């Protein structure tokens, strides 16, 4: 149970910590009433700029693995095409064995980053954070945010909503892309579905 804090998600006031529905019904982005209201301030990412990726919550489930992906759709649906720009294998959204202190609203002390690479054209996108928790039920977490790319790829991995991950491991994505980061404990890294 975690949510993305930066970049600021769509409709943050109605966005909870829960994973995607196990039946796939609310993929992508936790579909619900008024799910795609932009935050007030524009999130601007210059090509090549190191951008923050940060989280809220204490139920870190021993970490796991995450992707950062972009689509041109501003109200994503099941038909949206995603482009993975970063994979984090292990230690996302935290490198601890289990859960952390502080309740549902605590800023997660482990912080991350992403960079818009040269092959992404300036324009408006939706950015998705996806997360496959290491410990607990086999879930997929997902939050989405509007971003504007200014001047200054693999498809997104989907599982746990026939492709089912193994409890206890930090998964390694089949096609993680050319920007892959390992932030976890070597003993938990997958020797994906
Ligand atoms: C982005 O985060 C990774 C993982 O902590 C770190 O290794 C890297 O140095 C960071 N990049 C920066 C701060 O430019
Ligand atoms: Cu949880």
Curated annotation (Swiss-Prot):
Subcellular localization: Secreted
Domain of life: Eukaryota
Disulphide-bonded residues: 29-144, 66-92, 163-193
Protein residues bound to Cu(+): 1, 61
Glycosylation sites recorded in the entry for this protein: 99, 113
Function field: Lytic polysaccharide monooxygenase (LPMO)-like protein that acts as a strict peroxygenase and does not catalyze a monooxygenase reaction. It is indeed hardly active on chitin, while being very active on soluble oligomers of N-acetylglucosamine. Cleaves the glycosidic bonds byoxidizing the C1 position. Also unable to oxidize cellopentaose. Probably breaks glycosidic bonds in non-polymeric substrates possibly carbohydrates in the cell wall of the fungus or its competitors.
Similarity comment: family membership: Belongs to the polysaccharide monooxygenase AA11 family.
Name this polypeptide is given: AA11 family lytic polysaccharide monooxygenase B
Organism: Aspergillus fumigatus (strain ATCC MYA-4609 / CBS 101355 / FGSC A1100 / Af293) (Neosartorya fumigata)
Coverage span on the entire protein: 22 to 240 of 418
């Amino acid at each position: 149970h975690m949510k993305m804090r930066q970049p600021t998600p769509y409709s943050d006031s109605s966005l909870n910590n829960s994973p995607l529905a196990a039946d796939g019904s609310d993929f992508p982005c936790k579909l619900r009433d008024n799910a795609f209201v932009p935050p007030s301030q524009e999130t601007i990412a210059q090509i090549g700029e190191v951008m923050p990726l940060t989280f809220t919550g204490s139920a870190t489930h021993g970490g796991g693995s995450c992707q950062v992906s972009l689509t041109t759709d501003l109200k994503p649906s099941k038909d949206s095409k995603w482009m993975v720009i970063k994979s984090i294998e292990g230690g996302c959204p935290a490198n601890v064995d289990g859960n952390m202190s502080g309740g549902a609203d605590v800023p997660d002390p482990f912080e991350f980053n992403y960079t818009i690479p040269a092959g992404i054209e300036p324009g408006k996108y939706t950015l998705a954070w996806t997360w496959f928790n290491r410990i607990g039920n086999r879930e997929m977490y997902m939050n989405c945010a509007p971003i504007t790319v200014t001047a200054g790829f693999p498809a997104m991995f989907v599982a746990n909503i026939g492709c089912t991950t193994k409890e206890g491991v930090d998964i390694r994505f089949p096609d993680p892309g050319d920007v892959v980061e390992y932030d976890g404990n070597p003993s938990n890294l997958q020797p994906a579905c």
